[PDB]
Amino acid sequence: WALEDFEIGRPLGKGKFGNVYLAREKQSKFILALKVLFKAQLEKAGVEHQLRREVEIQSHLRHPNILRLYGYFHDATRVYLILEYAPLGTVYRELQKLSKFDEQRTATYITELANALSYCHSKRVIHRDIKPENLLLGSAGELKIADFGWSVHAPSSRCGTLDYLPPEMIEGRMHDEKVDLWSLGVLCYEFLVGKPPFEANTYQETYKRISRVEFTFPDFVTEGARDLISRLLKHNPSQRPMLREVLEHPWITANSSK
Numbered sequence: 126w127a128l129e130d131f132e133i134g135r136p137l138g139k140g141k142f143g144n145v146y147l148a149r150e151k152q153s154k155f156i157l158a159l160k161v162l163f164k165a166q167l168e169k170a171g172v173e174h175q176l177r178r179e180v181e182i183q184s185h186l187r188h189p190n191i192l193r194l195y196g197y198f199h200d201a202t203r204v205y206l207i208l209e210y211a212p213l214g215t216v217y218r219e220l221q222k223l224s225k226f227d228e229q230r231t232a233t234y235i236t237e238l239a240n241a242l243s244y245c246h247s248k249r250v251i252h253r254d255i256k257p258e259n260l261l262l263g264s265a266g267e268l269k270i271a272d273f274g275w276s277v278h279a280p281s282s283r284c285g286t287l288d289y290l291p292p293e294m295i296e297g298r299m300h301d302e303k304v305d306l307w308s309l310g311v312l313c314y315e316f317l318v319g320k321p322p323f324e325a326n327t328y329q330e331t332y333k334r335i336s337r338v339e340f341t342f343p344d345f346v347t348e349g350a351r352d353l354i355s356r357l358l359k360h361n362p363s364q365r366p367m368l369r370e371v372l373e374h375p376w377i378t379a380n381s382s383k
């Protein structure tokens with residue numbers, strides 16, 4: 126693959142390490158998203174193994190709720206990821222659009238997330254990073270996890286606006302699959318309320334709020350949601366439900382679709 130090969134369209138998203146662009150493949154007329162990262166800035170920040178964790182993992186996972194990486198190439202200056210395109214954009218933009226979600230949309234995304242994370246954890250891979258700006262919508266409004274790296278494998282290991290990160294990760298202790306489960310809780314909450322439960326005004330404050338696990342529920346939050354989120358947001362990782370217990374949880378089934 127090479128640049129010429131594609132016509133590039135409008136830009137889809139901001140320069141993390143470069144932008145991502147809508148794009149069309151000349152031969153087949155295939156519409157895709159082209160993540161464009163300048164080598165310069167990767168090396169300067171030394172995250173090439175993160176890139177080289179996004180690539181391997183996203184190409185070898187195949188699941189309807191995981192964004193697909195089709196291939197890559199580089200030139201002199203830049204590395205190019207060829208991604209699946211998610212026509213309806215991010216859950217982040219949708220949340221900004223509606224401010225909060227209803228229970229049906231929420232339970233439905235939590236379910237699509239739980240299956241995608243279920244597949245993920247079966248191959249021992251853990252995402253570590255399911256913010257809403259990494260959740261994308263397909264053409265049917267199907268939720269799709271993207272990004273990857275930072276990432277996966279076994280127990281582990283290694284500025285991430287803190288919000289979705291669990292206590293063990295924040296202190297630097299040892300973590301497993303359960304990190305994602307806590308994130309599901311932060312997400313669940315965020316969807317219903319419109320703001321993540323440890324949202325604070327400063328990194329340092331947020332860090333307190335997470336380590337202490339201090340959040341409260343606005344009054345409009347139904348008994349069963351609290352039940353799911355309360356259960357998901359425990360300090361001790363091993364007292365966090367497994368995904369099949371989430372997928373069960375009476376509230377999810379009272380509200381999800383399928």
Ligand SMILES: CN1CCN(C(=O)c2cc(Nc3ncc4cc(C(N)=O)n(C5CCCC5)c4n3)cn2C)CC1
Pocket residue numbers: 137138139145158160208209210211212213214215258261271272
């Ligand atoms: C109708 N509308 C929904 C879609 N709209 C969008 O502009 C849009 C589409 C997409 N699609 C898309 N597809 C694959 C992606 C892979 C990525 C990625 N970088 O992993 N992104 C990002 C670009 C910025 C946020 C997410 C992707 N975005 C992002 N945006 C911001 C506009 C409003």
Ligand SMILES: [Mg+2]
Pocket residue numbers: 258259272
């Ligand atoms: Mg992101």
